[PDB]
Amino acid sequence: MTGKELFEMWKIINPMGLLVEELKKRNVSAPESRLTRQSGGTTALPLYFVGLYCDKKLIAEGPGETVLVAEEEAARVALRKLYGFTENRRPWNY
Amino acid sequence: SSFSRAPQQWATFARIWYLLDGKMQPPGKLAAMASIRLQGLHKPVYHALSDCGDHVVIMNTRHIAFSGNKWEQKVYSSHTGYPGGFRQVTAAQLHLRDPVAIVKLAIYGMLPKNLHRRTMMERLHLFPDEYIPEDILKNLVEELPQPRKIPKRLDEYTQEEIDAFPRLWTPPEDYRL
Amino acid sequence: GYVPKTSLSSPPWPEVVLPDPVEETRHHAEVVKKVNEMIVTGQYGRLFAVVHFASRQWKVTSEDLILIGNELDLACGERIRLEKVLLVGADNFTLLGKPLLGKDLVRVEATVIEKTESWPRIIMRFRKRKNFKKKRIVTTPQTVLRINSIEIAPCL
Amino acid sequence: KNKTVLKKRCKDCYLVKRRGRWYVYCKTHPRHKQRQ
Amino acid sequence: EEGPMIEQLSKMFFTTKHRWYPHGRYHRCRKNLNPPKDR
Amino acid sequence: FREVVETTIIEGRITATPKESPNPPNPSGQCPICRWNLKHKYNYDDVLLLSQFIRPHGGMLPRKITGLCQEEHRKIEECVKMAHRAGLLPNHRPRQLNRYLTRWAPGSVKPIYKKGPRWNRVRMPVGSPLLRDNVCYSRTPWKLYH
RNA sequence: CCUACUUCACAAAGCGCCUUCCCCCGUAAAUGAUAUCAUCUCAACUUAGAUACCCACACCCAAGAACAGGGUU
Ligand SMILES: [Zn+2]
């Protein structure tokens, strides 16, 4: 699991719901899904960069070709952040 | 970063649309920037093989300015195939015929001579006026600022500025002008 | 020695006013302290290091592979402490030396995986019309290091 | 007539610079009209 | 229909016609089907 | 400044002396430009200065009325001309291509129909060669020929 | 392009008939600065100063080497 990030290992469907559940468990709140940036859109090669805000503070933010996809990505990122992963992680002691 | 792989990759690449207003600017001073953008040399990801070029919208190209006497002096010169088909045209004339042309030519010259040049040119969007199409406007992200600063004529300077500036000499009270 | 407002009276560039050195020093100290605190807390997550090995500079992290084109004269599986970590960075803070960081601050560890030869590389000379045609095949020896760990300390 | 060195022949003659070249014009003696 | 289709593609994607025209057999044979993938 | 007033009758009327600016920074200079310290620190850009040595219909004023050193006077004139060419003195007039830095009048320049080989090539003049000693400031000098 | 003529003859020619649509740049001349007159102005200025065509099996042909094109009521 050195290179392999989560979601490759534990594959899932509908991360938004999961996030919501996790949020509830944690803070007793629900996330808004704002759209941070977008080049294209009508071009046929857009770059929708979509956030996820909780009480006017972004917990995560992800990219995508389409808006739904972007949202999904953001959700995934949020999940990763929650579950002590990310690309950063910590090296692990051997 | 976080992110899954493909989406990250997409984010890294993805063609951004940029805007340039002409109006009083020199072509080629526009084109330097535009050419760079087209190439994708403004990205730290740049390679000739990767295809990282962005879109450049340029507007108000009818309101280009030329430095010195280039409107009258600068000759754009091309051949048809045909004997006696050597056409030389002064920049002004060219502009009058097609206002998009001058900027475009400059951009072309700036770009590397490889086959990608024409593809790069297709990501260039030139307009003679403020009227850009709707799709293109939707696409746009950021205007990078104009090279030439615009000198500002006396009508625009306002009174306060004038007051601030000193009057350097006394005329004779008997002088007409 | 005054000039009224024109295009060439004042500079094109804006005038920067660099701050007072005592205050600046204090600020720097504060920053350092913060960094130290962070280090203590384990608030970081994965480090990287620009290390200097075999005249090349390498941005390196835990778990990565590096290929050095020469013999190190080490048995494989031996562990190495790489000196000359001239950059050590992470999310939220970075440390650069002048040019090298101190040994107390940081250390990078590397296990030698394998010692090998390169694929055969062809040298070949030629000149027109002058019967000059040489051909030498070479295999430059190589070593593969696996960087295991970047330890970073609270010395600052 | 064309000349690289323009000279006034008469007092009525005058040098003018027009169209990026120096000319000599005289209202009395139009012979002395010269170009650069 | 071919040319029209090509034109449409170009319009969509902002690029020249030349890439959409289908390249020959030799070239395709040459192409690496299992390239060395990394990371 | 005086003015002729005609209706036959003719009269003369005086109105509003500029009266200088109060106290120059370098006094005991010989000129309006010289005293202040704009020896090499003006251009066509700056029209608040140029308009001071200009007639109501855009022409220059003479050296003897302004009181400018001759070398400077010429420069000033050139600047004024440039400004006019640009379109920076619209309220100064006798009674479509954008422009700046024009040394020659637009009419009176024949096109560079045969720019020669690079070792003897024809160049389009941009700006005046009077304004060389103008403060270049950047590490390269002014490219007066394009 | 072929109604006569002529070469000719279900056509194709000329010796026959028909149609043919813009500028041009050197100078000349006002007002007018630098240089309070004057001066055509590489001073600011004012005068003399592109439309048309083109674009949706078979058999015969004013279409044609083949290919293509037109017609087949
Ligand atoms: Zn002086």
N- to C-terminal Cα separation, chain B: 72
Identify the three-state secondary structure at position B105: helix
C80 pairs with which residues across the strands? Answer: C110
* Residue D34: how many other CB atoms lie within 10 Å: 20
Q: How far is CA A7 from the centre of its chain?
A: 11
B155, B21, B66, B90: CA torsion to nearest 10? -130
Query: Structural domain of residue F38, as residue ranges?
Result: 1-146
Q: How far is the CA of F125 from the centre of ligand 1 (A)?
A: 27
Q: What is the DSSP string of A4-42?
A: --TTTSS--S-HHHHHHHHHHHHTS---B--EEEEE-SS
Paired sense of beta strands D14-18 and D21-25, if any: antiparallel
Contact B22, B64 (CB under 8 A): yes
* Residue A80: how many other CB atoms lie within 10 Å: 22
SS (H, E, C) F95-131: CCCEEECCCCCCCCCCCCCCCCCHHHCCCCECCCCCC
Closest among A20, A33, A40 to A82, alpha carbons compared? A20
Q: How far is CA C111 from the centre of its chain?
A: 18
Which own/partner pairs from B5-10 qualify as long-range (CB within 8 Å, at least 24 positions apart)? Answer: B5/A5, B7/A62, B7/A63, B7/A64, B7/A69, B7/A73, B8/A63, B10/A47, B10/A63, B10/A64, B10/A65
Spatial neighbors of B58 by CB under 8 A, at least 6 apart, are: B19, B20, B21, B22, B30, B34, B103, B124, B125, B126, B127
Please tell me what resolution, in angstroms, this structure has: 3.4
A38 pairs with which residues across the strands? Answer: A48
**Which residues crowd ion ligand 1, with CB under 5 Å?**
F 31, 34, 69
Measured CA angle at B63 (ends B57, B64), to 5 deg: 75
Q: What letter represents residue F132's amino acid?
A: R
Spatial neighbors of C15 by CB under 8 A, at least 6 apart, are: none
Q: What letter represents residue F27's amino acid?
A: P
Partner residue opposite C8 with nearest CB, options F25, F48, F135: F135
Q: Is strand G in 7 Å reach of the CB of F114?
A: no
Integer Cα distance of C84 and C108 in angstroms: 9
Q: How far is CA D6 from the centre of its chain?
A: 6
Q: What letter represents residue B69's amino acid?
A: N
F interface toward C at CB cutoff 8 Å?
25-26, 36-38, 40-43, 45-46, 48-49, 134-135, 137
Q: What is the DSSP string of chain C?
A: ----S-TTTS-SSPPP----HHHHHHHHHHHHHHHHHHHHHT----EEEEEEETTEEEEEETT-EEEESS-----TT-EEEE--EEEEEESS-EEE-SSSPPTTTEEEEEEEEEEEEPPPEEEEEEETTTTEEEEEEE--EEEEEEEEEEEE-S--
User: Given the structure tokens 């941009």, which residue do they identify?
Assistant: F126
Query: Structural domain of residue A32, as residue ranges?
Result: 14-88
Spatial neighbors of B164 by CB under 8 A, at least 6 apart, are: C4, C5
Question: What is the domain partition of chain B in residue ranges?
Answer: 1-177
Contact A75, A20 (CB under 8 A): no
Per the entry, the structure determination technique was cryo-EM
The sign of the dihedral angle between the CA atoms of A5, A7, A9, A10 is: positive
For chain B, the residue count is 177
User: Which superfamily, per CATH, for B1-177?
Assistant: Ribosomal protein L13 (3.90.1180.10)
Contact D33, D26 (CB under 8 A): yes
F5 pairs with which residues across the strands? Answer: F11
Domains identified in chain F, total number: 1
H helix or E strand, kind and range, residue B18: strand B17-21
Integer Cα distance of F117 and F4 in angstroms: 58
Closest among F30, F2, F46 to B171, alpha carbons compared? F2
Residue of F nearest to C5 (CA): F46
Integer Cα distance of B29 and B56 in angstroms: 14
Q: Which two tokens stand for residue C133?
A: 């045609």
Integer Cα distance of A93 and A79 in angstroms: 24
